[PDB]
Amino acid sequence: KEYLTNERIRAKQVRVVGPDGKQLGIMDTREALRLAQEMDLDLVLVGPNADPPVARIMDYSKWRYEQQMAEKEARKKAKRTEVKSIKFRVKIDEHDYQTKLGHIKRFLQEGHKVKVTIMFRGREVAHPELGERILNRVTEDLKDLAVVEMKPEMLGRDMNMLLAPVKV
Amino acid sequence: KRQVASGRAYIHASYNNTIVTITDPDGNPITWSSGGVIGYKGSRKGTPYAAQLAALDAAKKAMAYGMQSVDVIVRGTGAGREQAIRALQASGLQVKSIVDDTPVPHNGCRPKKKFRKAS
Amino acid sequence: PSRKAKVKATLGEFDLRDYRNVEVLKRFLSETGKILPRRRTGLSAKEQRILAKTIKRARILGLLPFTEKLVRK
Amino acid sequence: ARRRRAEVRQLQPDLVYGDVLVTAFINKIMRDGKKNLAARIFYDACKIIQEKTGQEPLKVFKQAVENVKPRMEVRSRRVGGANYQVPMEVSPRRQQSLALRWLVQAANQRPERRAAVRIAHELMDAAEGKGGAVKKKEDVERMAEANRAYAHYRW
RNA sequence: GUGGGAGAGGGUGGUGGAAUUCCCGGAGUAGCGGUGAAAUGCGCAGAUACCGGGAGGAACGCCGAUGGCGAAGGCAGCCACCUGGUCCACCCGUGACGCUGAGGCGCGAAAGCGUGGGGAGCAAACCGGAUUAGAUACCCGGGUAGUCCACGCCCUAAACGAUGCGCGCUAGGUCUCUGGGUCUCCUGGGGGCCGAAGCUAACGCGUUAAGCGCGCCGCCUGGGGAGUACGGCCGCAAGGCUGAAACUCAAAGGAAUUGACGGGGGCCCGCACAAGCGGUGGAGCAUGUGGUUUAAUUCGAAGCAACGCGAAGAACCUUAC
RNA sequence: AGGCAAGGAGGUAAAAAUGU
Ligand SMILES: [Mg+2]
Ligand SMILES: [Mg+2]
Ligand SMILES: [Mg+2]
Ligand SMILES: [Mg+2]
Ligand SMILES: [Mg+2]
Ligand SMILES: [Mg+2]
Ligand SMILES: [Mg+2]
Ligand SMILES: [Mg+2]
Ligand SMILES: [Mg+2]
Ligand SMILES: [Mg+2]
Ligand SMILES: [Mg+2]
Ligand SMILES: [Mg+2]
Ligand SMILES: [Mg+2]
Ligand SMILES: [Mg+2]
Ligand SMILES: [Mg+2]
Ligand SMILES: [Mg+2]
Ligand SMILES: [Mg+2]
Ligand SMILES: [Mg+2]
Ligand SMILES: [Mg+2]
Ligand SMILES: [Mg+2]
Ligand SMILES: [Mg+2]
Ligand SMILES: [Mg+2]
Ligand SMILES: [Mg+2]
Ligand SMILES: [Mg+2]
Ligand SMILES: [Mg+2]
Ligand SMILES: [Mg+2]
């Protein structure tokens, strides 16, 4: 990633590439340094791997900045949309359920993938009939906004689903 | 490639990063060192050690321009302003006086809600 | 609890209101351009207040320092 | 610990020479609690030293001890969330003990066959300014220079 | 009245630096900023940090108080002007002119709204990021209104000393500010703290009474319902003031006191961790259990404090299966 | 040099829905 500029270079003969891409040849490192000084720029060791080290008369700092920007871009087109969870229950009544649904819808609209999970507690024996039914109802409610990425999965004292947005 | 031998040492000290600028006697700076400059990023940026490192780096840079005769001024307070000062003293640069000039308002505007709750 | 010397007890006879008398007024200002407390001057409250006012007046004129810089630290 | 300062045990001094440090070293060497086996081992080491590097075998030991001694040490502390390697100063006795331990470790971390010989070799190395124990000491010192960072977190 | 005095009392006209942002100028380079961490956010069109100057708007650091003022809301750079209150000494003048105050008229923080301006910061809403099960929130990055001013309007509030105003009486102290004095101590007016009596549900209060009285005014008659509905009035709107009942419950409360609790703290201790030596896990077996298999794997023991335990002796016996 | 304190700092304090 990071290289050796001007004075940090101790290897004696360097291959000198120019500001846009000016091939000046296998030259003295001192000569390269001098050239860099002349153009108000820096000779940066861009390949310590090839034929008598590949060194670039560039604004080192500028290049670094560019690289940083690129990296930032890479981590800003890697998408902020992740997995939003919502923990339901057994004896869920109406208004609260609707609120939950609304929340889910909002999340979907934003772009997210949704861990839809029913927290069980007491009996968790009559669980699938009610919990599963609830889940089914939820799915039905979101048939145009949501697609079922994965079907009910009981792990702990709970069962999880996940729902993905219908069209990207 | 300009060279000076003399000037000031403005240590802006914030809790997130202690930044050190070195200036010529006129007030026109030669170099500066910070926390991202000693690689450190985020939390350590304001850790006293980082400040010390920055100070050292700044001193080194100054030395690459012949500087010795150094007046030192600190502004605000960070984790190591004192640490930075100590580092500078150690370095081998003729430390004339270390002077406090915090940018403290004479009852200025409304501070941000963090620097509010002070009443 | 403050008691080394007092700026009233070190200073003799002087009028308070006269801001022009600046060096005598330079003793109640801190090393930084800041006023010393009641427990540093030695005055009565009224007197202290008057002194403060005078200092302010002086500042407005300019004679005495407004804010300065501590040394060594 | 909590109440009193938990005193250091003053050992019975050496049966042949006359120094407590030597006794301590012997004890350190000793595993399973077999003093007579490892005391003999120590004596053998001494003899070896006398033979090869033409010197009294107490002075050499002392030199070795001096060489392996740390002055700056590294502790572990949780502050804020993360753990920080904290550099701090050692009290003389403790430092000596540490050095002894290191020496013992080095003696056990060598490639040759017999117990005494290895020990002797390690001692010689320590005296010289190299070996295993010395390297360890150096490493420790370095750690208390790459992490002189978190020195203001004084214990 | 005279003679004084304290004061951020208020209003009008100014101005003084610190700060901040913003603009130009420089010099200077790879990051600043942010945090429990970080991420957006800005930065090579050169940002941050540093000096020069300007542009502005706010708000007054130190003094600064546990202080001073006002009737209350409130009030702080300094000046000038206009001006309120008040406090004292002379006891000089008047001769009960007083005290309160239903209504009334005024004032009335902050937000709010209308009209015009200005607008630096801060910053509801709002847009971002994290944080998270969720985040419409605490935390950061911006960001409108608004904050500021002029004119109007609003009128509420923990508009609290949760104590109406007035006088008299009833131990002191102590600290504070302010005045006069025959000024190491008195005597007046404020502000605090400790307390005699007494009082109080207790907490507390205690010459600044919640004590004794008297004067007048304001409310109050369980809570919730409910400051809501209704009407009425006010207001550009928001709302306000004024103010129920049906029903409902047998409470709602306050003080204190135990105890318990607290992601309150302090003081301690324990092989608790550190400092150190040696292990367990990993290997094999030994055993005891869980599980599973079985005709039955007898039963119990259950985190610590069940698990080489009851079993300190299972081939039969023991032994219950 | 010690004894108490006032201030200025600068660190810690920041993370917790599941039963019979
Ligand atoms: Mg008069
Ligand atoms: Mg510029
Ligand atoms: Mg008379
Ligand atoms: Mg008469
Ligand atoms: Mg009246
Ligand atoms: Mg009225
Ligand atoms: Mg902001
Ligand atoms: Mg978010
Ligand atoms: Mg958000
Ligand atoms: Mg914000
Ligand atoms: Mg307005
Ligand atoms: Mg109002
Ligand atoms: Mg109050
Ligand atoms: Mg109030
Ligand atoms: Mg009230
Ligand atoms: Mg008053
Ligand atoms: Mg009084
Ligand atoms: Mg009594
Ligand atoms: Mg009392
Ligand atoms: Mg009294
Ligand atoms: Mg009462
Ligand atoms: Mg209301
Ligand atoms: Mg109505
Ligand atoms: Mg109670
Ligand atoms: Mg209690
Ligand atoms: Mg442990």
From Swiss-Prot, chain A:
Monomer. Binds to proteins S7, S11 and S18 of the small ribosomal subunit. Disulfide bonds: none annotated. Gene3D superfamilies: Translation initiation factor 3 (IF-3), C-terminal domain, Translation initiation factor 3 (IF-3), N-terminal domain. It comes from Thermus thermophilus (strain ATCC 27634 / DSM 579 / HB8). InterPro entries: T_IF-3_C_sf (IPR036788), T_IF-3_N_sf (IPR036787), Translation_initiation_fac_3 (IPR001288), Translation_initiation_fac_3_C (IPR019815), Translation_initiation_fac_3_N (IPR019814). It is found in: Cytoplasm. Belongs to the IF-3 family. The keyword Cytoplasm applies. One of its GO terms (molecular function) is translation initiation factor activity. This is Translation initiation factor IF-3. IF-3 binds to the 30S ribosomal subunit and shifts the equilibrium between 70S ribosomes and their 50S and 30S subunits in favor of the free subunits, thus enhancing the availability of 30S subunits on which protein synthesis initiation begins. Keywords: Cytoplasm, Initiation factor, Protein biosynthesis. It comes from the Bacteria. GO terms for biological process: ribosome disassembly. One of its GO terms (cellular component) is membrane.
From Swiss-Prot, chain B:
Keywords: Ribonucleoprotein, Ribosomal protein, RNA-binding, rRNA-binding. Pfam families: Ribosomal_S11 (PF00411). InterPro entries: Ribosomal_uS11, Ribosomal_uS11_bac-type, Ribosomal_uS11_CS, Ribosomal_uS11_sf. Residues 99-119 are annotated as: Disordered. It comes from the Bacteria. GO terms for cellular component: ribonucleoprotein complex; ribosome. GO terms for biological process: translation. GO terms for molecular function: rRNA binding; structural constituent of ribosome. Residues 109-119 have a biased composition (Basic residues). Gene3D superfamilies: Ribosomal protein S11. Belongs to the universal ribosomal protein uS11 family. Located on the upper part of the platform of the 30S subunit, where it bridges several disparate RNA helices of the 16S rRNA. Forms part of the Shine-Dalgarno cleft in the 70S ribosome, where it interacts both with the Shine-Dalgarno helix and mRNA. HAMAP family: Ribosomal_uS11 (MF_01310). Part of the 30S ribosomal subunit. Interacts with proteins S7 and S18. Binds to the C-terminus of IF-3; however exactly how IF-3 interacts with the 30S subunit is unclear. May contact the C-terminus of Era. This is Small ribosomal subunit protein uS11.
Swiss-Prot record, chain C:
The keyword Chaperone does not apply. One of its GO terms (biological process) is translation. Keywords: Ribonucleoprotein, Ribosomal protein, RNA-binding, rRNA-binding. GO terms for molecular function: small ribosomal subunit rRNA binding; structural constituent of ribosome. It comes from the Bacteria. Disulfide bonds: none annotated. Coiled coil: none annotated. The keyword Transmembrane helix does not apply. One of its GO terms (cellular component) is ribonucleoprotein complex. Part of the 30S ribosomal subunit. Forms a tight heterodimer with protein bS6, also interacts with protein uS11. Binds to the C-terminus of IF3 and to the central section of Era. Belongs to the bacterial ribosomal protein bS18 family. Located on the back of the platform of the 30S subunit where it stabilizes the close packing of several RNA helices of the 16S rRNA. Forms part of the Shine-Dalgarno cleft in the 70S ribosome, where it probably interacts with the Shine-Dalgarno helix. This is Small ribosomal subunit protein bS18. It comes from Thermus thermophilus (strain ATCC 27634 / DSM 579 / HB8). The chain holds residues 16 to 88 of 88 of the full protein.
Curated annotation (Swiss-Prot), chain D:
GO terms for molecular function: rRNA binding; structural constituent of ribosome; tRNA binding. It comes from the Bacteria. Disulfide bonds: none annotated. CDD domains: uS7_Bacteria (cd14869). It holds the Pfam family Ribosomal_S7. GO terms for cellular component: small ribosomal subunit. Keywords: Ribonucleoprotein, Ribosomal protein, RNA-binding, rRNA-binding, tRNA-binding. GO terms for biological process: translation. The keyword Secreted does not apply. InterPro entries: Ribosomal_uS7 (IPR000235), Ribosomal_uS7_bac/org-type (IPR005717), Ribosomal_uS7_CS (IPR020606), Ribosomal_uS7_dom (IPR023798), Ribosomal_uS7_dom_sf (IPR036823). NCBIfam families: rpsG_bact. Part of the 30S ribosomal subunit. Contacts proteins S9 and S11. Binds to the C-terminus of IF3 and to the C-terminus of Era. One of the primary rRNA binding proteins, it binds directly to 3'-end of the 16S rRNA where it nucleates assembly of the head domain of the 30S subunit. Is located at the subunit interface close to the decoding center. Binds mRNA and the E site tRNA blocking its exit path in the ribosome. This blockage implies that this section of the ribosome must be able to move to release the deacetylated tRNA. Belongs to the universal ribosomal protein uS7 family. PANTHER family: RIBOSOMAL PROTEIN S7. This is Small ribosomal subunit protein uS7. It comes from Thermus thermophilus (strain ATCC 27634 / DSM 579 / HB8).
